[PDB]
Design a protein around this ligand. Sequence first.
Ligand SMILES: C[C@@H]1CC[C@@]2(OC1)O[C@H]1C[C@H]3[C@@H]4CC=C5C[C@@H](OCCC(CO[C@H]6O[C@H](CO)[C@@H](O[C@H]7O[C@H](CO)[C@@H](O)[C@H](O)[C@H]7O)[C@H](O)[C@H]6O)CO[C@H]6O[C@H](CO)[C@@H](O[C@H]7O[C@H](CO)[C@@H](O)[C@H](O)[C@H]7O)[C@H](O)[C@H]6O)CC[C@]5(C)[C@H]4CC[C@]3(C)[C@H]1[C@@H]2C
Ligand SMILES: CCCCCCCCCCCCCCCCCCCCCCCCCCC(=O)N[C@@H](CO)[C@H](O)[C@H](O)CCCCCCCCCCCCCC
Lengths: 63, 177
Amino acid sequence: PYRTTVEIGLILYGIIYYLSKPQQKKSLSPQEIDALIEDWEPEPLVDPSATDEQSWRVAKTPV
Amino acid sequence: PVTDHRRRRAAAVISHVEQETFEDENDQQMLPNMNATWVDQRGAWLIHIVVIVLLRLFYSLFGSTPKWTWTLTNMTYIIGFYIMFHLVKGTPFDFNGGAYDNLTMWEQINDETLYTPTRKFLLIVPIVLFLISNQYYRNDMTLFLSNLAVTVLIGVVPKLGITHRLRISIPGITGRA
Ligand SMILES: C[C@@H]1CC[C@@]2(OC1)O[C@H]1C[C@H]3[C@@H]4CC=C5C[C@@H](OCCC(CO[C@H]6O[C@H](CO)[C@@H](O[C@H]7O[C@H](CO)[C@@H](O)[C@H](O)[C@H]7O)[C@H](O)[C@H]6O)CO[C@H]6O[C@H](CO)[C@@H](O[C@H]7O[C@H](CO)[C@@H](O)[C@H](O)[C@H]7O)[C@H](O)[C@H]6O)CC[C@]5(C)[C@H]4CC[C@]3(C)[C@H]1[C@@H]2C
Ligand SMILES: CCCCCCCCCCCCCCCCCCCCCCCCCCC(=O)N[C@@H](CO)[C@H](O)[C@H](O)CCCCCCCCCCCCCC
């Protein structure tokens, strides 16, 4: 009866604990949010490094 | 202050230990703990059976009834395990600067991993011991209730997913963070 019921409860929790999750592993402030904003460095809209070397096409276009 | 390193002692009925900051967690816990590393080693799982057998034989050498012997051995084993693991907080030797001054040995096992085989074994053993032991004092309901209360209250509730980093201020103002 009750003596069997509590034993069944303990055993039932036993298998539940045995087949637990797959080894669960142990796991920001607004003051540092502005630091991330200030650390952002965007890129130029257009790259001008190779403009000079490739500019002969415009100079050779007939008008 | 330029460092702001203080220990808080907030008082409430239910409270939890705050999560460690970057410096305390990612940097001050790098070397082996040397306090919870011996659990997963050679001969660290059979020693509990030897302790139980030795206690049972020592109590049987007195020449008492089986009921009293088994109740006493169960209570002694559970109380000893609780005193060793769950009661004390800290480490017997300085680790870095006192990083583990808010946690017990149970929490430090396997780098605060919730479910590992050793924890499963440690949770399984008291239930099996109780199932084996109850067969001698089933007639007496008071001893059955006492054994059930001891097992559930001491050997089951602390080893749970809940009651992890859980502190109660009833027996003293505990320190968190
Ligand atoms: C069958 C039979 C039945 C009968 C029987 O046998 C079996 O049943 C048995 C039942 C047994 C007891 C069961 C369990 C314990 C606790 C254990 O515990 C670890 C060792 C000690 C330290 O533990 C602390 O370790 C950390 C550092 O302290 C704590 O860290 C924080 O606190 C730091 C504070 O700086 C901060 O840095 C941070 O906040 C943070 O780091 C941490 O919280 C806590 O774990 C235990 O406490 C100490 O407490 C005082 C120091 O705090 C000592 O001094 C005091 O001694 C006198 C009294 O007050 C006064 O004259 C002095 O003035 C006054 O100072 C005292 O001697 C000593 O006991 C020590 C053994 C003992 C008592 C057993 C004794 C024997 C029995 C009575 C048997 C018994 C005979
Ligand atoms: C005649 C008969 C009576 C027999 C009495 C003995 C009862 C035996 C049954 C209960 C014991 C559990 C059985 C499993 C243990 C197997 C052996 C493992 C040995 C490991 C030893 C190395 C561990 C190093 C880490 C140190 C450590 O943990 N530091 C702290 C946390 O960082 C802990 O706070 C600390 O150690 C515990 C405090 C020391 C003992 C407290 C009680 C004072 C003596 C009174 C004894 C009461 C009887 C019950 C224990």
